[PDB]
Amino acid sequence: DTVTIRTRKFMTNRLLQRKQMVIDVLHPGKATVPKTEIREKLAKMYKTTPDVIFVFGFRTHFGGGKTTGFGMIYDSLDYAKKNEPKHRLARHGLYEKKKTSRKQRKERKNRMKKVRGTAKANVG
Amino acid sequence: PVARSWVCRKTYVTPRRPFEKSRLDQELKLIGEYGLRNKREVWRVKFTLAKIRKAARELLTLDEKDPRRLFEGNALLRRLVRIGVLDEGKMKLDYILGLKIEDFLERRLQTQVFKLGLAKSIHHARVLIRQRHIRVRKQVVNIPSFIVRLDSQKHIDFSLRSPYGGGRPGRVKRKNAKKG
Amino acid sequence: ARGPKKHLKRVAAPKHWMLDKLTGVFAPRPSTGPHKLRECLPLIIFLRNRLKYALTGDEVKKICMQRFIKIDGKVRTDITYPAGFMDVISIDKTGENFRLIYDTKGRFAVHRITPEEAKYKLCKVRKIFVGTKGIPHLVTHDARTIRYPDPLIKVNDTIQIDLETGKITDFIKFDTGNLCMVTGGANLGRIGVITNRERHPGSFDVVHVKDANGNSFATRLSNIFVIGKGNKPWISLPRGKGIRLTIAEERDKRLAAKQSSG
RNA sequence: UACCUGGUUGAUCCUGCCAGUAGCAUAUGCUUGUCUCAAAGAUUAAGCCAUGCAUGUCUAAGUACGCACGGCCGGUACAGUGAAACUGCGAAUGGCUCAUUAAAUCAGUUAUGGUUCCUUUGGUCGCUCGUACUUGGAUAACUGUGGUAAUUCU
RNA sequence: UGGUGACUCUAGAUAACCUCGGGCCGAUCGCACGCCGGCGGCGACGACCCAUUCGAACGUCUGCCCUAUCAACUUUCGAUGGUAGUCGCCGUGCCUACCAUGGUGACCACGGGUGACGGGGAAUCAGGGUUCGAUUCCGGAGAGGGAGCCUGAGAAACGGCUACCACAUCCAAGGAAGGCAGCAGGCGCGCAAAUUACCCACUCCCGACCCGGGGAGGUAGUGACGAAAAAUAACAAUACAGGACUCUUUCGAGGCCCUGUAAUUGGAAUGAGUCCACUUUAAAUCCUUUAACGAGGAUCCAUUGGAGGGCAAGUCUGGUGCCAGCAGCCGCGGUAAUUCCAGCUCCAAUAGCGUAUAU
RNA sequence: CUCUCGGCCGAAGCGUUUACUUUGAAAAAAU
């Protein structure tokens, strides 16, 4: 309905294979719109699929008139799996992080530092 | 070492003599004329005008054709015309010293709601702005200490989400309708 | 310190990089190279802080490792690579060519080049010596040692080097009347004809320079760099033509352009 | 904002201090709803330290006969992923603290025509007139036998 | 030949030397494969030297707090200089030998003290000035105190070694292992100072390196150090009291204003808070954005100091009666205490405001 | 202020020297 998207600072990296831009949002009544709804608005503005467009860093002003964020549209999903920080692939289910905390392996690293060549693989 | 910035001013100066009737009465008239919260809000504008006058003092000491006086002075004379304090006919650097405290507090947002007839009291205006009913062109302003620029004055309105402007009522008119 | 320092704080950065206070502690510490770290942009500041082709310090990695950035026709992959003055930065995928000419206010500008002009550069000589069986040698400001130059070429002269071969083409000698750009001190980035060179034995030599509007000034010798033969520059020139404005006419220039832009 | 006020006397005018006054830092006492920044074991003990972590590193490109996997197709010296280990590099930056130090340090200013410099950038690298279609020995990782109550010991 | 303000510079020529603890002059890898039985293109590691970069190290000139109850100091064990050397990466008493007899000093040497790391800076200011700078940037120094080293380009390294001194750990008594002034955290000390949290996503650094690691650093927690904004109410109608403008000789009247007391009425607007969701982010939290709920006065109740003077604001009431106490100073207190202890009132600042101390 | 070279001026000698004043360059960023 009365949600509207404009793009201010449009730019085309040929050297990251993407279309880098900045997103205006007009959500005068609602809350802050979610990421998935703005991708459907955007992928049909620029005729791509919502599979490949990645947005982040949204911020709503004092009074809810606007929200300004960043957005980048790749040329192919294989490039987006290369040129994107790997937390923004997990936000689309395209990446999995192992569930060990830093204290887990840094304990392990100093334990396996005490062993000679063979049994350093045994310490876990 | 961190990535932080530690710079900060203080925006008021406590006076030299704590108790004198000529000063306590003259501050408290300005509180009552302009709806201020405490004496610090008087000691704040008086402190900013103590700087605007002190900067214009050293410009008057310079040569009249000194380029530092011609550039920096024409900026200070410009920055007061835009907030509606000096005037176009009186834009000379001699007149900066002819300024008073309530020359500035005519341009606070708390008073400009009241003078425009939006609020029905100078105290009712400090309500409304903090009650988020006031917008400057598109922007809900939540601070009374807001120096309205001279072009930023002729349109100040009722903040379309409000009950006064766009008319969705608050908690009270909804609950009263839930009975009858 | 017990060895060379490998870190640079953003506070201790050179001001012409225009780093800000709040986006971190450390500055990107230019690598050892053809320029001085007080004098250079690293490639990262040029690539993301100026051109805005990247956001972080890791997307610059994902441009340099993909080998799109040629600096003087050579593929460079280091991101802390000191690219200095009169130095052609070229990118083939975009088809763009950039030269780090100081702007008026003493900062490296975004200056776009004809790709024809992208094939050469200019270089001030720094010393001239004869080594090993009578072979004359130059040294440029890029530390390009060129052997067998013209015998007419003396110290403080500026040479046009073809980037492909690495060999000289022609040269301007340091003479009163040639075009110059200041490369240091207070008058950095300003452009004018040399009026005079007063000499001081055992000390530093002052060159008096005169702009294209009569605005005369002075430098030291080692901060000057010849551009052209007389008034004609051999290279292209940024949109501020190298003439410093005073602040009032700089202000006044904005106040009319904002009126015409309605 | 270029400022004073109380106190010696029976009373006055002085000298003059004491006390008042405003700030600023540290501690502290009471109080405390919101929101934006933000100092924080310096002062005294440069006193003593449980435990954990803070320095590691592989490209296609130095060395791969761990089936540790799968995998051609199976006689292709060596396909691949690759733990370990040899090698190379880094570990001299960073972080902390302010004890020592009074022409010392440091700052501005000059020199190296009086020195050293991994790296990077450039030059140079058939300019020497006297088995090579490829040289030699060894050690790890691996397997096996072990020591010590005890460790990144061997 | 070529250069410097200036060479004993660079380049040239001749005679020789060239360390076996030796100097370069390649026995290395990867990828595309294609050309006249034979050749080659990109790179990657190299490497004596020369320049370059990052520097470092020795110097030059000028500049430092207090102290005379520090007036002479240095030289026998280098104090000042000369010559030759040793050593050093290089210049030099840096060191040795041999000579010379110097060198500094009321223009404050030398010695002593510093609650002294030095600057950029900070507070305070009319102008002049005074005081602080342990502390995030730059330089220096040290890792318990000294000292001596190996490696490397760079260390007299301490998250490297070796000893000594002082502490202190494990033990089978034979031995072995240390160094938080790194991030946490503890004990002690004190007037005086925080969580054994999460992350490499940012900023950057390091390594063979688009890929690994970083208590650097970031993110939360503790946080009334300090700084910025800023709630604790607003409006209307009546009850009067008022008091100004108007009519009225006054009386009185007014619809024209304003103020209060209303545990009077009246519905309007709200955040604090509870809490979906989105946003935020490495994942969160906070803030922002938005549903739903959330305000009539003992509740969603503002406290710290004071009321003789300086110094703003009681000659109120009750108690005590040189006691208990107040009071920075002057003073108050012995039956009306404007000064104590309480109640009521009002005044100063206000989410702050007292006190101690340095300035 | 002076005698020569180079395109009357410039370059060269120094005008007894300094203080002072004015100018110009050099003076990290943060504050």
From Swiss-Prot, chain A:
Modified residues (Phosphothreonine): 7
Compositionally biased region (Basic residues): 99-117
Record cross-link Glycyl lysine isopeptide (Lys-Gly) (interchain with G-Cter in SUMO2), residues: 35
Disordered: annotated span: 90-124
GO cellular component: cytoplasm; cytosol; cytosolic ribosome; cytosolic small ribosomal subunit; endoplasmic reticulum; membrane; nucleolus; nucleoplasm
Tissues expressing the protein: Mature tissues, such as adult brain, skeletal muscle, heart, and kidney, express low levels, whereas tissues and organs with significant populations of proliferating cells, such as fetal brain, placenta, bone marrow, and various glandular organs, contain significantly higher levels.
One MF annotation (Gene Ontology) recorded for this entry: RNA binding
Record localization: Cytoplasm; Nucleus, Nucleolus
Record-stated family: Belongs to the eukaryotic ribosomal protein eS24 family.
Disease tied to this protein: Diamond-Blackfan anemia 3: A form of Diamond-Blackfan anemia, a congenital non-regenerative hypoplastic anemia that usually presents early in infancy. Diamond-Blackfan anemia is characterized by a moderate to severe macrocytic anemia, erythroblastopenia, and an increased risk of developing leukemia. 30 to 40% of Diamond-Blackfan anemia patients present with short stature and congenital anomalies, the most frequent being craniofacial (Pierre-Robin syndrome and cleft palate), thumb and urogenital anomalies.
This protein's name: Small ribosomal subunit protein eS24
Swiss-Prot record, chain B:
SMART domains to which the protein is assigned, alphabetical: Ribosomal_S4, S4
Gene Ontology CC: one annotated term: cytosolic small ribosomal subunit
Region (Disordered): 161-180
Record keywords: Acetylation, Cytoplasm, Isopeptide bond, Nucleus, Phosphoprotein, Ribonucleoprotein, Ribosomal protein, RNA-binding, rRNA-binding, Ubl conjugation
Record annotation: effect of changing residue 136 to F: In a breast cancer sample; somatic mutation
Compartments, as annotated in UniProt: Cytoplasm; Nucleus, Nucleolus
Family: Belongs to the universal ribosomal protein uS4 family.
Residues bearing PTM N6-acetyllysine: 65, 115, 154
Principal location listed in the UniProt entry: cytoplasm
Entry GO MF terms: RNA binding; rRNA binding; structural constituent of ribosome; translation regulator activity
Entries under InterPro entries matching the protein: Ribosomal_uS4, Ribosomal_uS4_CS, Ribosomal_uS4_euk/arc, Ribosomal_uS4_N, S4_RNA-bd, S4_RNA-bd_sf
Name recorded for this polypeptide: Small ribosomal subunit protein uS4
Record-linked Pfam families: Ribosomal_S4, S4
SUPFAM superfamilies for this protein: Alpha-L RNA-binding motif
Cross-link (Glycyl lysine isopeptide (Lys-Gly) (interchain with G-Cter in SUMO2)): 92, 138
Swiss-Prot record, chain C:
Any GO BP: positive regulation of cell population proliferation
One example GO MF annotation: RNA binding
Gene Ontology CC: one annotated term: small-subunit processome
Domain S4 RNA-binding: 41-103
Subcellular location: Cytoplasm; Nucleus, Nucleolus
Keyword Acetylation annotated: yes
PTM sites of type N6-acetyllysine: 232
Stored InterPro entries: KOW, Rib_uL2_dom2, Ribosomal_eS4, Ribosomal_eS4_C, Ribosomal_eS4_central_region, Ribosomal_eS4_central_sf, Ribosomal_eS4_KOW, Ribosomal_eS4_N
UniProt crosslink position (Glycyl lysine isopeptide (Lys-Gly) (interchain with G-Cter in SUMO2)): 229
Database matches in Pfam families: 40S_S4_C, KOW, Ribosomal_S4e, RS4NT
Coiled-coil regions, chain positions: none
Protein keywords: Acetylation, Cytoplasm, Isopeptide bond, Nucleus, Ribonucleoprotein, Ribosomal protein, RNA-binding, rRNA-binding, Ubl conjugation
HAMAP family: Ribosomal_eS4
Subunit structure, as described in the record: Component of the small ribosomal subunit. Part of the small subunit (SSU) processome, composed of more than 70 proteins and the RNA chaperone small nucleolar RNA (snoRNA) U3. Identified in a IGF2BP1-dependent mRNP granule complex containing untranslated mRNAs.
Protein task: Component of the small ribosomal subunit. The ribosome is a large ribonucleoprotein complex responsible for the synthesis of proteins in the cell. Part of the small subunit (SSU) processome, first precursor of the small eukaryotic ribosomal subunit. During the assembly of the SSU processome in the nucleolus, many ribosome biogenesis factors, an RNA chaperone and ribosomal proteins associate with the nascent pre-rRNA and work in concert to generate RNA folding, modifications, rearrangements and cleavage as well as targeted degradation of pre-ribosomal RNA by the RNA exosome.
Family per similarity comment: Belongs to the eukaryotic ribosomal protein eS4 family.
The protein's name in its UniProt record: Small ribosomal subunit protein eS4, X isoform
Primary gene name: RPS4X
